[PDB]
Enzyme design. Structure first.
Site, PDB file in Angstrom:
ATOM      1  N   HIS A 124      86.379   0.841   2.574  1.00  0.00           N
ATOM      2  CA  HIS A 124      87.066   1.483   1.450  1.00  0.00           C
ATOM      3  C   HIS A 124      86.158   2.461   0.730  1.00  0.00           C
ATOM      4  O   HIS A 124      86.679   3.244  -0.104  1.00  0.00           O
ATOM      5  CB  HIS A 124      87.712   0.482   0.483  1.00  0.00           C
ATOM      6  CG  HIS A 124      86.852  -0.175  -0.532  1.00  0.00           C
ATOM      7  ND1 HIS A 124      86.281  -1.415  -0.412  1.00  0.00           N
ATOM      8  CD2 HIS A 124      86.468   0.290  -1.766  1.00  0.00           C
ATOM      9  CE1 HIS A 124      85.597  -1.681  -1.520  1.00  0.00           C
ATOM     10  NE2 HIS A 124      85.679  -0.678  -2.358  1.00  0.00           N
ATOM     11  N   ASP A 139      87.067  -4.830   6.014  1.00  0.00           N
ATOM     12  CA  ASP A 139      86.509  -3.813   5.088  1.00  0.00           C
ATOM     13  C   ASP A 139      85.010  -3.620   5.336  1.00  0.00           C
ATOM     14  O   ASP A 139      84.147  -4.081   4.578  1.00  0.00           O
ATOM     15  CB  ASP A 139      86.799  -4.188   3.651  1.00  0.00           C
ATOM     16  CG  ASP A 139      86.469  -3.081   2.675  1.00  0.00           C
ATOM     17  OD1 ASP A 139      86.300  -1.933   3.117  1.00  0.00           O
ATOM     18  OD2 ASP A 139      86.449  -3.391   1.457  1.00  0.00           O
ATOM     19  N   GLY A 197      82.051   0.250  -8.511  1.00  0.00           N
ATOM     20  CA  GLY A 197      80.800   0.906  -8.260  1.00  0.00           C
ATOM     21  C   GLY A 197      79.766   0.063  -7.546  1.00  0.00           C
ATOM     22  O   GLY A 197      78.760   0.591  -7.027  1.00  0.00           O
ATOM     23  N   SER A 225      80.971  -1.761  -4.962  1.00  0.00           N
ATOM     24  CA  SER A 225      81.630  -1.768  -3.687  1.00  0.00           C
ATOM     25  C   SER A 225      80.731  -1.254  -2.572  1.00  0.00           C
ATOM     26  O   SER A 225      80.048  -0.251  -2.760  1.00  0.00           O
ATOM     27  CB  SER A 225      82.858  -0.848  -3.707  1.00  0.00           C
ATOM     28  OG  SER A 225      83.882  -1.422  -4.434  1.00  0.00           O
ATOM     29  N   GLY A 226      80.768  -1.947  -1.446  1.00  0.00           N
ATOM     30  CA  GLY A 226      80.002  -1.604  -0.277  1.00  0.00           C
ATOM     31  C   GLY A 226      78.591  -2.203  -0.253  1.00  0.00           C
ATOM     32  O   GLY A 226      77.956  -2.164   0.798  1.00  0.00           O
TER      33      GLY A 226
HETATM   34  N1  LIG Z   1      85.156  -8.225  -9.029  1.00  0.00           N
HETATM   35  C1  LIG Z   1      85.155  -7.936  -7.632  1.00  0.00           C
HETATM   36  C2  LIG Z   1      85.280  -6.513  -7.396  1.00  0.00           C
HETATM   37  C3  LIG Z   1      84.237  -5.754  -6.779  1.00  0.00           C
HETATM   38  C4  LIG Z   1      84.361  -4.388  -6.492  1.00  0.00           C
HETATM   39  C5  LIG Z   1      85.403  -3.605  -6.857  1.00  0.00           C
HETATM   40  C6  LIG Z   1      86.483  -4.331  -7.453  1.00  0.00           C
HETATM   41  C7  LIG Z   1      86.347  -5.713  -7.769  1.00  0.00           C
END
Ligand SMILES: NCc1ccccc1
Ligand SMILES: NCc1ccccc1
Ligand SMILES: [Ca+2]
Length: 223
Positions: A40, A84, A175, A177-178
Site C-alpha cells: 500500500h 500487503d 506514516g 506504514s511499510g
Molecule cells: N494503528 C495501526 C495503523 C498503522 C498504519 C496506518 C494505519 C493504522
C-alpha cells in the site's frame, strides 16, 4: 508511533524512510540492494533514505539512493490488504556499516506473546496530528490469533497478525506504514493497517513476513 519512545540515532539501522518529495512510508533494508515495505506504500519515483534519525536535517550518516524498480506482491489486494508487501530495489548498493545494516528474514514465524520492536516517523497522536522529526520506537507483543480476529471480525487472514495493546495508548500510526516489526532480531512484520491509532480494542495489523520468505528469495534472485 503513538505512546512510544525516541529510539536513539541509528539504533535501528535497517529502518528506511521512503521519500517522494516528503517522507511517506517506512521500510526495512534486507540486503545492500533491497528494501521490504508495504504494497500500500507503492508509488513511482521513490527515493530510499538510509541512515536517518532526524528526517528533516542532514546529520551526516545518510545515504539517499533512488529506487530502480518496485515489485508489489502478485496477490496483493488493496481492498482487504491481504499480501500487503512490496520489494524495492536500490539503483546502487548501500554501504553497510553500524549506522546502516540489513535485517534478517525469519526462519520461522514468531510466537504469540513475543515482544517486538516497531519503529517509524509516523504520527504520534491517537487524536489529532503531530509528526516527529526523529525516529520513534515501540515495544509491543504479538496478540493471539483469536484476539486479533475478535478485534477485526471477518478481516484477518493467515497473512496478518495483530500486535500492541487492547487497552489502547500504544500503536503504530499513519506514516509508519511499510516499516518494520522486528522480533528476536528478525523481520516478522510490516506496518500494514488497523482502525485509527491506539484506540481501544483496535490493535495494529501487520503483514506476516514469514509467509513471504520464499517469494522474497525467488524475486531477489531474478531481479
Ligand atoms: N494503528 C495501526 C495503523 C498503522 C498504519 C496506518 C494505519 C493504522
Ligand atoms: N463477517 C464478519 C464478521 C463476523 C462477526 C462479527 C462481525 C463481522
Ligand atoms: Ca537526516
Amino acid at each position: 508511533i503513538v505512546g512510544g519512545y525516541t529510539c536513539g540515532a541509528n539504533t535501528v539501522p535497517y529502518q528506511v524512510s521512503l521519500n517522494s518529495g516528503y517522507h511517506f512510508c517506512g521500510g526495512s533494508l534486507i540486503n545492500s540492494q533491497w528494501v521490504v515495505s508495504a504494497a500500500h506504500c507503492y508509488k513511482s519515483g521513490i527515493q530510499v533514505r538510509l541512515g536517518e534519525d532526524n528526517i528533516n536535517v542532514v546529520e551526516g550518516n545518510e545515504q539517499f539512493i533512488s529506487a530502480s524498480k518496485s515489485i508489489v506482491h502478485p496477490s496483493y489486494n488493496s481492498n482487504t490488504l491481504n499480501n500487503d508487501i512490496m520489494l524495492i530495489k536500490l539503483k546502487s548498493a548501500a554501504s553497510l556499516n553500524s549506522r546502516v545494516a540489513s535485517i534478517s528474514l525469519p526462519t520461522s514465524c514468531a510466537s504469540a506473546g513475543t515482544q517486538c520492536l516497531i519503529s517509524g516517523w509516523g504520527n504520534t497522536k491517537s487524536s489529532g496530528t503531530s509528526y516527529p522529526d526523529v525516529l520513534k520506537c515501540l515495544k509491543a507483543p504479538i496478540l493471539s490469533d483469536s484476539s486479533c480476529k475478535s478485534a477485526y471480525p471477518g478481516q484477518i487472514t493467515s497473512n496478518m497478525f495483530c500486535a500492541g495493546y487492547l487497552e489502547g495508548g500504544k500503536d503504530s500510526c499513519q506514516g509508519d506504514s511499510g516499516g518494520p516489526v522486528v522480533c528476536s532480531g528478525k523481520l516478522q512484520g510490516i506496518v500494514s493497517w488497523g482502525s485509527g491509532c491506539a484506540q481501544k480494542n483496535k490493535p495494529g495489523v501487520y503483514t506476516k513476513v514469514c509467509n513471504y520468505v520464499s517469494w522474497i528469495k525467488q524475486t531477489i534472485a531474478s531481479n
